[PDB]
Design a protein around this ligand. Structure first.
Ligand code: NI
Length: 341
């Protein structure tokens, strides 16, 4: 049964609710992004209208085989009427195709559902500038002040400079990057661009990247592993065993691996600056964990919410414990007292 924080009152709509069977009264199912916790339940047998971005619709059709007749892509930044209700999709600054949804309810209430997002000051100059929001359904993944991490641009700078130095010292080194979902493609694209290489990967991952509308993608990726000195592997293989095993397969072309594991936040962020990050090393294999986040930091979240000044906040992450819910409610009240709304 579908939880309350996935229903949009006064409409026939749900958000990210495909794992509960036929939801009573639902006439349109929105999907914010193509991450498995959010799409859980969709397949070729789904027969209700799905509303989403163009990129999410390419992935639903090619990766999950949802039939074309049930996929309803909407452009971004454009007022659209769905089942008699005005909606807008906005870029969420999460993974490719990820959106926030603005719903203009028939009674005059305005609701923003962030989906998963990484808040940014640029959002203060979207269509959100124009009007008031009564209810915010908020991605609270990192809603506590201990959650700190650098800008995506600083993280990419560290990865490019690390990879370029290593391969210039040793032209026989291979670079490997872990993946387990869409998102964070800049990590492997930026490293391959500095090295003058295409990125090599499995047929299944190539298929997924081909759905993402990335400009000039045919110039950037390939399924021919041997031609490439940046390889992608599933995240579970990014360990000394899995990497040893991979180096055997390359036929004595390489004598060293440098590997990257993009994570979210880890507690080593509490002590160590990005500049000062060091790898784990066994023999000719080194592994870097790098804190490349596609969710808001605490500070980014607080800035967004203090700017938007919503009347009510409904968290969508960390909702399962009383301690999490109480902690989040305290910070919402500080933010409101500090800013005066
Ligand atoms: Ni996500």
């Amino acid at each position: 049964t579908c939880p309350f924080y996935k229903k949009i009152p006064g409409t026939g709509f749900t958000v990210d609710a495909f794992q509960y069977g036929v939801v009573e009264g639902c006439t349109a199912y929105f999907l914010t992004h193509f991450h498995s916790d959010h799409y859980a339940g969709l397949s070729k047998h789904f027969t209700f209208p799905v509303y989403c971005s163009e990129i999410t619709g390419n992935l639903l059709k090619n990766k999950l085989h949802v039939q074309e007749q049930y996929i309803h892509p909407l452009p971004l930044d454009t007022e659209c009427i769905v089942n008699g209700v005005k909606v807008v999709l906005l870029d969420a600054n999460h993974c490719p195709g990820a959106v926030m949804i603005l719903f203009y309810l028939p009674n005059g209430t305005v609701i923003l559902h962030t989906g998963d997002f990484r808040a940014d000051p640029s959002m203060e100059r979207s269509l959100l500038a124009d009007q008031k929001v009564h209810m915010l359904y908020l991605d609270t993944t990192y809603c506590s002040p201990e959650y700190t991490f650098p800008s995506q641009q600083e993280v990419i700078r560290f990865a490019i400079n690390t990879a370029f130095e290593a391969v210039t010292l040793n032209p026989h080194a291979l670079v490997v990057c872990g993946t387990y979902s869409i998102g964070k493609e800049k990590v492997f694209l930026a490293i391959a661009d500095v090295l003058g290489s295409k990125v090599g990967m499995s047929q299944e991952k190539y298929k997924t990247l081909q759905c993402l509308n990335i400009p000039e993608i045919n110039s950037l990726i390939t399924t021919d592993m041997c031609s490439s000195l940046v390889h992608l592997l599933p995240m579970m293989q990014i360990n000394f065993k899995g990497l040893q095993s991979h180096l055997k397969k390359c036929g004595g072309k390489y004598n060293q691996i440098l590997a990257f594991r993009p994570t979210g936040w880890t507690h080593s962020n509490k002590f160590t600056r990005i500049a000062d990050v060091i790898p784990q090393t066994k023999g000719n294999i080194s592994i870097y964990g790098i804190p490349y986040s596609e969710h808001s930091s605490y500070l980014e979240m607080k800035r967004f919410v203090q700017w938007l000044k919503p009347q009510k906040i409904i968290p969508t992450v960390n909702v399962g414990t009383w301690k999490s819910r109480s902690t989040m409610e305290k910070y919402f009240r500080e933010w409101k007292l500090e800013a005066g709304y």
